[PDB]
Coordinates of C-alpha atoms and ligand atoms in Angstrom, one line a residue:
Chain Z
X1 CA 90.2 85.1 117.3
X2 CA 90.0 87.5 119.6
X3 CA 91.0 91.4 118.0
X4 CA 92.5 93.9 119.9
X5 CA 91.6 97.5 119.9
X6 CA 94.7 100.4 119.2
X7 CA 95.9 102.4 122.2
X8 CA 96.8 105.9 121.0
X9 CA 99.4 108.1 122.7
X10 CA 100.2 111.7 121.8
X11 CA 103.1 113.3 122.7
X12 CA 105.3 116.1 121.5
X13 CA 109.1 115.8 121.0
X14 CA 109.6 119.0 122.7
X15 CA 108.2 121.4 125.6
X16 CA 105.4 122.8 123.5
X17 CA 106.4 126.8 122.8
X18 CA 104.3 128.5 121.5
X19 CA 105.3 129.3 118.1
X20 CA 108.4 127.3 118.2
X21 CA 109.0 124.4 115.5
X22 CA 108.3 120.9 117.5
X23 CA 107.3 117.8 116.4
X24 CA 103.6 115.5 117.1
X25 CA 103.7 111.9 117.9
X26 CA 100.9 109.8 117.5
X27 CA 101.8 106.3 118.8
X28 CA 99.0 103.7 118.3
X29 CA 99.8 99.8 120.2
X30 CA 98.9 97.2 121.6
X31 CA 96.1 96.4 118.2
X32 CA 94.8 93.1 116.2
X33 CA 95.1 93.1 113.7
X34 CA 97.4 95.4 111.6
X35 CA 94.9 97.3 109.4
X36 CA 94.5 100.4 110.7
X37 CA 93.9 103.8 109.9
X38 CA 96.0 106.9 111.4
X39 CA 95.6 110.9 110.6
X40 CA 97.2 113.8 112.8
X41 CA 94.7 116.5 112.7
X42 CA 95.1 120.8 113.3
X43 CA 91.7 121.7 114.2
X44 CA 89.9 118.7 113.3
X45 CA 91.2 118.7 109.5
X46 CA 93.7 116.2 108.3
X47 CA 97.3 117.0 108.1
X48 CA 99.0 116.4 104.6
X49 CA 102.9 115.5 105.4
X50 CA 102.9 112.9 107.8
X51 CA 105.1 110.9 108.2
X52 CA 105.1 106.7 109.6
X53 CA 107.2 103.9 110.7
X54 CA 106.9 100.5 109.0
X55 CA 104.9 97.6 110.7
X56 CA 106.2 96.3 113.7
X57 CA 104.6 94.1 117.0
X58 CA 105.4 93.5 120.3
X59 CA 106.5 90.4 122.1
X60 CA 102.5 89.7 122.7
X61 CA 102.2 89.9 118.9
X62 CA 100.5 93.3 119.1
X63 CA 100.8 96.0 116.5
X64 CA 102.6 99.0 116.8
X65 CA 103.1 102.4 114.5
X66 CA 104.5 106.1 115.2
X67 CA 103.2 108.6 113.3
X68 CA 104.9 112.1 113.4
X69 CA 105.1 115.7 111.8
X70 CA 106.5 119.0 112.1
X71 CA 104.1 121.6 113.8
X72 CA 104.5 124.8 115.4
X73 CA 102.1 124.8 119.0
X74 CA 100.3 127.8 119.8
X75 CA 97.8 128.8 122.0
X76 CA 94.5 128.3 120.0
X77 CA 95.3 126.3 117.4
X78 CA 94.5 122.2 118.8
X79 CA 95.9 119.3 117.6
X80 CA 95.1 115.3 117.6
X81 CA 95.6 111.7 116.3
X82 CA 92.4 110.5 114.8
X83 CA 92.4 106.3 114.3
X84 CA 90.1 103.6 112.9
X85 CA 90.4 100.1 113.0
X86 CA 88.2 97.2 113.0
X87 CA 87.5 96.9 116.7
X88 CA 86.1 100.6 116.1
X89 CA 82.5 101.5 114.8
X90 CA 83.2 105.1 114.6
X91 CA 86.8 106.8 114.4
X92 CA 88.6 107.4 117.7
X93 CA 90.2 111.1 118.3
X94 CA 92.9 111.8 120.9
X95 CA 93.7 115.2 121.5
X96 CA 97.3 116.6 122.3
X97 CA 97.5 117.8 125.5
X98 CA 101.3 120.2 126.9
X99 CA 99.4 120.0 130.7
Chain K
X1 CA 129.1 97.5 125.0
X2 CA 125.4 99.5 125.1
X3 CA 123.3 99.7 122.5
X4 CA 121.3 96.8 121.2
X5 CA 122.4 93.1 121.5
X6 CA 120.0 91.3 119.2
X7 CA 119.5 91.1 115.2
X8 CA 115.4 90.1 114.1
X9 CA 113.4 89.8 110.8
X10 CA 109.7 90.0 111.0
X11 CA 106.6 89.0 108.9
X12 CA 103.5 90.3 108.4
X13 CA 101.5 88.1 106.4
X14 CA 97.5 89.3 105.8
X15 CA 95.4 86.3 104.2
X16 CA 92.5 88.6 103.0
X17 CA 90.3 85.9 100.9
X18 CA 91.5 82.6 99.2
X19 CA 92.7 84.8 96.2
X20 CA 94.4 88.0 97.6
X21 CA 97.3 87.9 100.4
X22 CA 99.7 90.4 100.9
X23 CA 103.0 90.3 103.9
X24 CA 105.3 92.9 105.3
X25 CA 108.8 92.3 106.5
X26 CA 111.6 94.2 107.8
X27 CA 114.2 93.7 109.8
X28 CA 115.5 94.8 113.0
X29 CA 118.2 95.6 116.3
X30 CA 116.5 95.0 119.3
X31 CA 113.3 97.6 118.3
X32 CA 115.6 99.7 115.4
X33 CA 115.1 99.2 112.4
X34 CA 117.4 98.6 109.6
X35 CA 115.9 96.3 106.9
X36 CA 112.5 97.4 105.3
X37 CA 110.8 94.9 102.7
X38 CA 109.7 96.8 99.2
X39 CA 107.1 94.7 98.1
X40 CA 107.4 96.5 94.4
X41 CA 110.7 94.7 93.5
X42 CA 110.7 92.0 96.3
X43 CA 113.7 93.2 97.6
X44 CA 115.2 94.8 100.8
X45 CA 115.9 98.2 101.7
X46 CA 118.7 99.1 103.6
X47 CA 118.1 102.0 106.2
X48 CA 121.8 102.5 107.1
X49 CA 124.2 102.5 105.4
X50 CA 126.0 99.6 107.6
X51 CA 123.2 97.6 107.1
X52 CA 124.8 95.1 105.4
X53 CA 127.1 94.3 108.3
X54 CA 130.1 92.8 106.9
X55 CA 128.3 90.2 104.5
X56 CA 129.3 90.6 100.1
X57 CA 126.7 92.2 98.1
X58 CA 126.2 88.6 96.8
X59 CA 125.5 86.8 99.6
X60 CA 123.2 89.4 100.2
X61 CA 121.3 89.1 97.0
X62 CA 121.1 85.6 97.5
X63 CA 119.3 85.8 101.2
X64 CA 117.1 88.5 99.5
X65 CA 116.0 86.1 97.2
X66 CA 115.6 83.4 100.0
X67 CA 113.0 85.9 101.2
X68 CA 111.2 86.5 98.4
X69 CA 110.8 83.2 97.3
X70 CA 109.7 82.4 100.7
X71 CA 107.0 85.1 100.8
X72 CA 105.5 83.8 97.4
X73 CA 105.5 80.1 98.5
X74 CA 104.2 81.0 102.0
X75 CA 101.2 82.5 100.4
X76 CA 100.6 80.2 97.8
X77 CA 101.2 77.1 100.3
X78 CA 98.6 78.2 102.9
X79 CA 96.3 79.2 100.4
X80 CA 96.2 75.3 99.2
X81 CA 95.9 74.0 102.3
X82 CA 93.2 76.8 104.1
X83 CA 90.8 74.3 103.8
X84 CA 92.2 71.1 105.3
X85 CA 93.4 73.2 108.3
X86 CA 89.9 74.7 108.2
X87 CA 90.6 78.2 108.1
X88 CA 88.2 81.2 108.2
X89 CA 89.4 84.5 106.6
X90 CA 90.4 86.5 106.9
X91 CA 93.4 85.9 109.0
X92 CA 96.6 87.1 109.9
X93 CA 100.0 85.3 110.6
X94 CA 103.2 86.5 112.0
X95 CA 106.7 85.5 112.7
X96 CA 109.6 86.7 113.7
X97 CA 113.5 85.3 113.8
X98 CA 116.9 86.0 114.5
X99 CA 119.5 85.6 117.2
X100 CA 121.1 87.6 119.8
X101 CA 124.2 87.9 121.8
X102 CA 124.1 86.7 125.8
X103 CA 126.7 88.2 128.8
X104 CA 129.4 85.7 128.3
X105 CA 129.6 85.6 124.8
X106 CA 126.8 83.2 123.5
X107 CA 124.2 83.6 120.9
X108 CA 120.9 82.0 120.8
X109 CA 118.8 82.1 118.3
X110 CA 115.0 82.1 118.4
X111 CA 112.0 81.6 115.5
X112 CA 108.2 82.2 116.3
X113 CA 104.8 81.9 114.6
X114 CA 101.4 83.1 115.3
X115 CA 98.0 82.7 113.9
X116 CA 95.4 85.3 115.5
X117 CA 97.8 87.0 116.8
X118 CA 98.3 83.9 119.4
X119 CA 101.4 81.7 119.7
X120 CA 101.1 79.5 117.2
X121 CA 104.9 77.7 116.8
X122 CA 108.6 78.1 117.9
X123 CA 111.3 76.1 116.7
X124 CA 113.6 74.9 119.5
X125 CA 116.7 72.7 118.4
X126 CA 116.1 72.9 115.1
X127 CA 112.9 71.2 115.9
X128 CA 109.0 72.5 114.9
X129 CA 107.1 72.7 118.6
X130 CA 103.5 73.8 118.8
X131 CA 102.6 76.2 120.8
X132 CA 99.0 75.0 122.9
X133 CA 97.5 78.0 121.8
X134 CA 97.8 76.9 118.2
X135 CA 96.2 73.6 119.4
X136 CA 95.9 70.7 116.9
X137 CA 96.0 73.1 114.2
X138 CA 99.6 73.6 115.4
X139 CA 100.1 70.4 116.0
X140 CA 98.9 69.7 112.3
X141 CA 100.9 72.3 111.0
X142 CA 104.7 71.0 112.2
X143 CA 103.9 67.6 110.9
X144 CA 103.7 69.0 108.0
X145 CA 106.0 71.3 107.6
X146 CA 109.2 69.2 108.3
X147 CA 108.1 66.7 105.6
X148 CA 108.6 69.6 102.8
X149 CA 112.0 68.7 101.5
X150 CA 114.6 71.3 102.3
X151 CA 112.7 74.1 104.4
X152 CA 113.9 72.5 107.8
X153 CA 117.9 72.7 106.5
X154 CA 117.6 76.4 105.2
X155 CA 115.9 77.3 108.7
X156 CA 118.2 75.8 110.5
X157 CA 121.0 77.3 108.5
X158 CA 120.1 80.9 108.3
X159 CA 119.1 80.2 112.4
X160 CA 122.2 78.8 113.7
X161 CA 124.7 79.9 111.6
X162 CA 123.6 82.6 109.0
X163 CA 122.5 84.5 111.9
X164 CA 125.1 84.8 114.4
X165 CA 127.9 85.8 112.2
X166 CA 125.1 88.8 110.6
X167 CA 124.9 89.6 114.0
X168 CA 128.3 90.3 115.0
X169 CA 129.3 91.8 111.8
X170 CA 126.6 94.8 111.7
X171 CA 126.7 95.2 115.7
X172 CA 130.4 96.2 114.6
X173 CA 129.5 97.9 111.1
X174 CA 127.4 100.1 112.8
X175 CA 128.9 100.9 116.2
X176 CA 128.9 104.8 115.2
X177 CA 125.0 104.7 115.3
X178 CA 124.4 102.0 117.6
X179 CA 126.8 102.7 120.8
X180 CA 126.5 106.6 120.3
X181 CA 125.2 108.9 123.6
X182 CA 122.3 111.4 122.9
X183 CA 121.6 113.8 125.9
X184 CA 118.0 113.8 126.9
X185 CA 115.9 117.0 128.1
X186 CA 113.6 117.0 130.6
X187 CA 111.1 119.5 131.7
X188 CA 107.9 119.7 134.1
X189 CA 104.2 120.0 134.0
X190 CA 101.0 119.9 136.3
X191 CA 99.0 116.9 134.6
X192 CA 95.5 115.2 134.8
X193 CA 94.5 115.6 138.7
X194 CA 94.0 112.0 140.3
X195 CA 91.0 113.5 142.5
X196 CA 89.9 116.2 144.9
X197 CA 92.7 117.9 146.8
X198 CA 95.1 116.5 144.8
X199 CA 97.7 117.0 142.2
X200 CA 99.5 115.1 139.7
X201 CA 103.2 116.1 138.7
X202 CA 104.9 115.1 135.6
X203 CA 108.5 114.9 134.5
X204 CA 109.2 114.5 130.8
X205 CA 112.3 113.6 129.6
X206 CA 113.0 113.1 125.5
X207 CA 115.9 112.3 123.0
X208 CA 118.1 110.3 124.9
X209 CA 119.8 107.7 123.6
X210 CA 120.5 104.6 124.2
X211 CA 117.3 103.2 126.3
X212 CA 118.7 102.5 129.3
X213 CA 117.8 106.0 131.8
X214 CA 116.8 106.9 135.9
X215 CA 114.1 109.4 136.3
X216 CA 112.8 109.8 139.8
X217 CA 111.0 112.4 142.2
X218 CA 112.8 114.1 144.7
X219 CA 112.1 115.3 147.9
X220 CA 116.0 116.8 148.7
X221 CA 117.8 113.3 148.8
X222 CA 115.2 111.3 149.7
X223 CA 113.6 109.4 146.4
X224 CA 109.9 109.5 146.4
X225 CA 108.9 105.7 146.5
X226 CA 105.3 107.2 144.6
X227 CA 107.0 107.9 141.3
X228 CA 105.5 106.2 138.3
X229 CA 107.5 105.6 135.4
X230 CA 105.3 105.6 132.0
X231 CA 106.4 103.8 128.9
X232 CA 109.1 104.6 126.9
X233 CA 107.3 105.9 124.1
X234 CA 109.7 106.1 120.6
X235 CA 110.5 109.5 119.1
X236 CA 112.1 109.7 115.3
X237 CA 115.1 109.4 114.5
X238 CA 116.0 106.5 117.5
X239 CA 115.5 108.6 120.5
X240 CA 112.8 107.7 123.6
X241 CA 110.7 109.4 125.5
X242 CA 109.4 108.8 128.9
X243 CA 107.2 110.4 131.8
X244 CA 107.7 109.9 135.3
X245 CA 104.4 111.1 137.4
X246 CA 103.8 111.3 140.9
X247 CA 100.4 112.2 142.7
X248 CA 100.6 114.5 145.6
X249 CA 98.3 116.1 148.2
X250 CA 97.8 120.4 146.8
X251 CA 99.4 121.8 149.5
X252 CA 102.4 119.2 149.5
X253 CA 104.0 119.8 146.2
X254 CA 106.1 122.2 147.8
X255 CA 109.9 120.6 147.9
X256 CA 109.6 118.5 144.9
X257 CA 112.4 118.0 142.1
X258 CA 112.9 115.4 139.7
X259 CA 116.2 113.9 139.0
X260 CA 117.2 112.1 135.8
X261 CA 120.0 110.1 135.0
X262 CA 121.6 109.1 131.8
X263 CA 124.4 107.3 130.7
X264 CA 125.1 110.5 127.8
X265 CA 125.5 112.7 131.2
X266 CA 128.7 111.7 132.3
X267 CA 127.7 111.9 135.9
X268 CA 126.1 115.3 135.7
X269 CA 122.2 114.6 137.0
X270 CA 119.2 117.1 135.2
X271 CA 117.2 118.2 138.5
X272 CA 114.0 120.3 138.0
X273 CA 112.7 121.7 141.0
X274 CA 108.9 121.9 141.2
X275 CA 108.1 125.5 142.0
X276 CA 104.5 126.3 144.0
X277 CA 101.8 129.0 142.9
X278 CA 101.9 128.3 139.0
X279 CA 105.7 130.0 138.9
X280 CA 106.2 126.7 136.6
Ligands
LIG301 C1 131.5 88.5 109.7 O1 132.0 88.6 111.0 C2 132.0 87.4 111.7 C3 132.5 87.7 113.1 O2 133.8 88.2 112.9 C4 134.5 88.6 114.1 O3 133.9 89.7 114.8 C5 133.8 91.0 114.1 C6 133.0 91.9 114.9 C7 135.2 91.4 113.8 O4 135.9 91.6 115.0 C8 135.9 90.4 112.9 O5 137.3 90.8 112.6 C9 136.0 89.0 113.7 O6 136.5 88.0 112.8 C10 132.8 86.3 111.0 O7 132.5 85.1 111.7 C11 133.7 84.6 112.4 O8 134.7 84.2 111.6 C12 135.9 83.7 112.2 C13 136.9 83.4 111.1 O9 137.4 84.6 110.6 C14 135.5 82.4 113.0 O10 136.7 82.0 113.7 C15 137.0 80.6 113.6 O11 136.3 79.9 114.6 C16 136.6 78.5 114.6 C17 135.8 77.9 115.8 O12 134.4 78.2 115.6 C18 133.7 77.2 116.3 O13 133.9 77.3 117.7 C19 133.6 78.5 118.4 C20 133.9 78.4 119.9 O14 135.3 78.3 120.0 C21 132.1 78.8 118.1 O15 131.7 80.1 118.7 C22 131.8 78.8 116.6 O16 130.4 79.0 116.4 C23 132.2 77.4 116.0 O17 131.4 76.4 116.6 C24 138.1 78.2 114.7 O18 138.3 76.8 114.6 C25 138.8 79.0 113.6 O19 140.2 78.7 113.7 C26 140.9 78.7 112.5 O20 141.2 79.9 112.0 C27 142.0 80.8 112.8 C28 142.1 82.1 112.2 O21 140.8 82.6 111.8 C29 143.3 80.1 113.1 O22 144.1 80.9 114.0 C30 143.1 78.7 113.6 O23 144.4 78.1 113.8 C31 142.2 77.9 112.7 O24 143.0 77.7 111.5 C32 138.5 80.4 113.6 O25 139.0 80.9 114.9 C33 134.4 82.7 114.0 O26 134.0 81.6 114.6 C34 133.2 83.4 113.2 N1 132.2 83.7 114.2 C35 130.9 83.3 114.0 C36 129.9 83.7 115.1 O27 130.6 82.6 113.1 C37 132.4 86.2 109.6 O28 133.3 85.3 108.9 C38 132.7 84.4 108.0 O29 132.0 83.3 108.7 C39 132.8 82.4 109.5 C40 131.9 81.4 110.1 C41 133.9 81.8 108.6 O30 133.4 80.9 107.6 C42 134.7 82.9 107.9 O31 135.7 82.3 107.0 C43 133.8 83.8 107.1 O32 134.5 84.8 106.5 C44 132.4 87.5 108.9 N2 131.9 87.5 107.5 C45 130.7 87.0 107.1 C46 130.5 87.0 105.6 O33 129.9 86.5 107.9
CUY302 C1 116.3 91.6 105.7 C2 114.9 91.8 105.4 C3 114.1 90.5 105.4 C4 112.7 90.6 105.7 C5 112.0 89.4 105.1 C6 110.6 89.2 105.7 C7 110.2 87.7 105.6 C8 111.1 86.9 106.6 C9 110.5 86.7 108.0 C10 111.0 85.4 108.7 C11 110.1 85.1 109.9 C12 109.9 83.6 110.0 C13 108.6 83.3 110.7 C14 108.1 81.9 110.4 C15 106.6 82.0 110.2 C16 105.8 80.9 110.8 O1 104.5 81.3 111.0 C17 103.5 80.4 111.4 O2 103.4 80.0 112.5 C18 102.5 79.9 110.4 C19 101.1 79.8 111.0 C20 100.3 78.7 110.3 C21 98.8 79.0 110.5 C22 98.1 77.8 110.0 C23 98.4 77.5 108.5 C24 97.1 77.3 107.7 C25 97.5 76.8 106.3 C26 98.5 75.7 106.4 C27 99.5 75.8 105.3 C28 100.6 74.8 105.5 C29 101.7 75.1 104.5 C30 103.0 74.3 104.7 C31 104.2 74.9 104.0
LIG303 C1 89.5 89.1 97.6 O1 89.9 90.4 98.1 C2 90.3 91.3 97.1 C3 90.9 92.5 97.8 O2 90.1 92.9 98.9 C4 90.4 94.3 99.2 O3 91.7 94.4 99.8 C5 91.8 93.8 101.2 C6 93.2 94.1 101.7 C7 90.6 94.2 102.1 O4 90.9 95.4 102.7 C8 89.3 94.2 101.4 O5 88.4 94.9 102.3 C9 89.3 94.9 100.0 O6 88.1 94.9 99.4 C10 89.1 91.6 96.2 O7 89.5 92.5 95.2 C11 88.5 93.5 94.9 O8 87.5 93.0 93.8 C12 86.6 94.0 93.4 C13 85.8 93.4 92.2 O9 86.7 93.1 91.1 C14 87.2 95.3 93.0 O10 86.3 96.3 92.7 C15 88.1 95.8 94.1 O11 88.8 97.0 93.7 C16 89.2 94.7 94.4 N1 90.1 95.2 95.4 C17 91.4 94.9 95.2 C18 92.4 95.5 96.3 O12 91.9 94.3 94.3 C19 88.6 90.3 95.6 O13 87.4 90.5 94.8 C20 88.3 89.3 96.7 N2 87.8 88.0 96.1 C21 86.8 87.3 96.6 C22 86.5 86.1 95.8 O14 86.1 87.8 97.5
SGF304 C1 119.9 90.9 104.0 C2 120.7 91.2 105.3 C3 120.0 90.5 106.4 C4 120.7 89.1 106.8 C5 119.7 88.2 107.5 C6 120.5 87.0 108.1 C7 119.8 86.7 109.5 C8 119.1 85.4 109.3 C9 117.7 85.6 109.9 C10 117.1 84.2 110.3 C11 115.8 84.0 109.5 C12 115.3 82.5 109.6 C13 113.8 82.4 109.3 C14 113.6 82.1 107.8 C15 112.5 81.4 107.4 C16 112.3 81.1 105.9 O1 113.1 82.0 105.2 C17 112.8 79.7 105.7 N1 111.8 78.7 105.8 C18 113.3 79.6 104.2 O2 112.7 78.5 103.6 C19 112.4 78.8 102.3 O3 111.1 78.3 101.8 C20 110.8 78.6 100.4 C21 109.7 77.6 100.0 O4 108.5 77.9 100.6 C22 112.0 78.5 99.4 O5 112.2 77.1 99.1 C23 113.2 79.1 100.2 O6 114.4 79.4 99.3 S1 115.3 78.3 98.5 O7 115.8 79.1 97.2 O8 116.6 78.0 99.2 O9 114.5 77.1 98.1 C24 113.5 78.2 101.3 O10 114.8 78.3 101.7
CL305 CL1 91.7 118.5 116.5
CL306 CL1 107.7 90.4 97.4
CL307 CL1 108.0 88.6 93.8

């Protein structure tokens, strides 16, 4: 069987203000299988309170997740979505970008 | 009526070694979700209040323990017979079923397996069909499975009739959720350039509600065939988000606007004009 490696997508819920309460979305698709690891990171360390959505696939039978928390942007500070799965030797990292 | 149309259970089921499996289920309108499975008490959870739809608390227990009985015996039965159908773990199988409702008024119901995350099986007229990615693995598989007494009639049962009437009942239970309008908001940003000389523009628009929405690029009236709609990426809290992007020569991005339409808007359009000179 052929495995599929995770697409990640990060995205904030809001225009990114700098110091304004938002919320980080780390959306990982189109994998195979479903074990997989996710972390949303502020400056390369793990964040605690994350939340996740429950399994699901799409109609191709790919696996899909949303992982989200509250955050606050600000100018320095750099956030990401950092995920490992099998198809993965080493964890992938993809930073947030507002631009 | 907006909102979703369609009522699905899924499965999950991860075949680690001959001795440890473990499945996942939930349940679902069109890509909301309503049902999770809590494998600690093999029993659902219900993630609205409505999501019972209109069926007793009993006949509710009784289709939980339909699933949970299913789940163990899944597990066990392909286990047993990993070796005749000459399995390699580990493996993963999926599934999903349910039903949804058709312009004119007809529901059609719908059940599909996959091994490897390939088809594997669909059942069409109450009937097991292999899929020819499942090949004669498949093909074993049906003949077998309509030969163990009574798992045909409950499919076709919760299929055909079960699901239909769950259907219509929580589409109406929860119409306060599921047919309620959620404005989006939309704003602008310079994104990844394609190349030299050029720019590319974005137009975000999140938390609308339902899926359905228009986002294009503008110049004036005319609508810029270039626009490139992204996916519609979920937010929490069953909201969407979307980009719309459009890659322009520097010195043309001058005129722009992006326009976005919603059915929460009640005609009134969002335009953002695209301003030169980093004046946002
Ligand atoms: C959960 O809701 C389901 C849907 O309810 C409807 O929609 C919701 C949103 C609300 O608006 C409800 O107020 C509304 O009822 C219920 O299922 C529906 O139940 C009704 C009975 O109440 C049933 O109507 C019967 O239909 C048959 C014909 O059905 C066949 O033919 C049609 C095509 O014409 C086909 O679509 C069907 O699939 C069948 O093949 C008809 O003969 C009946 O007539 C008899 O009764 C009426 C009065 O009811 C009387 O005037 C007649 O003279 C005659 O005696 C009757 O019209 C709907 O078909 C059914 N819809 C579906 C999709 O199944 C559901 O009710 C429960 O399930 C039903 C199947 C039935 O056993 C009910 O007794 C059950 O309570 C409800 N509850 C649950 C737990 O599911
Ligand atoms: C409300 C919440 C409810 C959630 C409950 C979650 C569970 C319910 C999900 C229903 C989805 C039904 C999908 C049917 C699954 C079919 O999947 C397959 O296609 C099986 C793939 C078979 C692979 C080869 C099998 C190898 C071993 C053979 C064992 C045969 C056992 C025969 C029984
Ligand atoms: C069969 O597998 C179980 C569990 O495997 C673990 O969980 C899976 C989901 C997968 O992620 C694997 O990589 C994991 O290792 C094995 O159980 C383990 O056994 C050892 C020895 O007793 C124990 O130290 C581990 O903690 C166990 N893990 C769990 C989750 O129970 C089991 O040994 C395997 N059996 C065979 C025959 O290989
Ligand atoms: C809780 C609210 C949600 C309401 C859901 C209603 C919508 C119906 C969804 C359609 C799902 C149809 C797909 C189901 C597949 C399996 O569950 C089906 N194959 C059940 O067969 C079961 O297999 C087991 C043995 O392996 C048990 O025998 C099951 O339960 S029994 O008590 O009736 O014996 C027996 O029914
Ligand atoms: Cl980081
Ligand atoms: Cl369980
Ligand atoms: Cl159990």
């Amino acid at each position: 069987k052929i495995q599929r490696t995770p697409k990640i997508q990060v995205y904030s819920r809001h225009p990114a203000e700098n110091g304004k309460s938002n919320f980080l979305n780390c959306y990982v698709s189109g994998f195979h299988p479903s074990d997989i690891e996710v972390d949303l990171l502020k400056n390369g360390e793990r964040i605690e309170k994350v939340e996740h959505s429950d399994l699901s696939f799409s109609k191709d039978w790919s696996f899909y997740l949303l992982y989200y928390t509250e955050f606050t942007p600000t100018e320095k500070d750099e956030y990401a979505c950092r995920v490992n799965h099998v198809t993965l030797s080493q964890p992938k990292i993809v930073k947030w970008d507002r631009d | 009526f907006q909102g979703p149309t369609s009522f699905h259970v899924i499965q999950t089921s991860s075949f680690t070694n001959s001795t440890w499996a473990q499945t996942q289920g939930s349940g679902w309108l069109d890509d909301l979700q309503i049902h999770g499975w809590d494998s600690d008490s093999g029993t659902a959870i219900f993630l609205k209040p409505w999501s019972k739809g209109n069926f007793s608390d009993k006949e509710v227990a009784e289709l939980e323990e339909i699933f949970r009985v299913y789940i163990f015996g899944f597990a066990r039965e392909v286990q047993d017979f990993a070796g005749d159908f000459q399995m390699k773990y580990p493996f993963e199988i999926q599934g999903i079923a349910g039903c949804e409702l058709h312009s004119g008024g007809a529901i059609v119901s719908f059940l599909r397996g996959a091994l490897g995350g390939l088809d594997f099986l669909s059942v069409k007229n109450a009937s097991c069909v292999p899929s020819p990615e499942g090949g004669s693995r498949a093909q074993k598989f049906c003949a077998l499975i309509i030969q163990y007494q009574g798992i045909m009639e409950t499919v076709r049962i919760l299929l055909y009739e079960t699901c239909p009437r769950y259907l219509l009942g929580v589409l109406n239970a929860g119409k306060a959720d599921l047919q309620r309008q959620v404005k989006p908001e939309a704003w602008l940003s310079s994104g990844p350039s394609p190349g030299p000389g050029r720019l590319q523009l974005v137009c975000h628009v999140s938390g609308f509600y339902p899926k359905p929405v228009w986002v294009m690029w503008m110049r004036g009236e005319q609508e810029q065939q270039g626009t490139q709609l992204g996916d519609i990426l979920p937010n929490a809290n069953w909201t969407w988000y979307l980009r719309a992007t459009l890659d322009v020569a520097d010195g043309e991005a001058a005129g722009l606007s992006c326009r976005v339409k919603h059915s929460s808007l009640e005609g009134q359009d969002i335009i953002l004009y695209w301003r030169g000179s980093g004046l946002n």
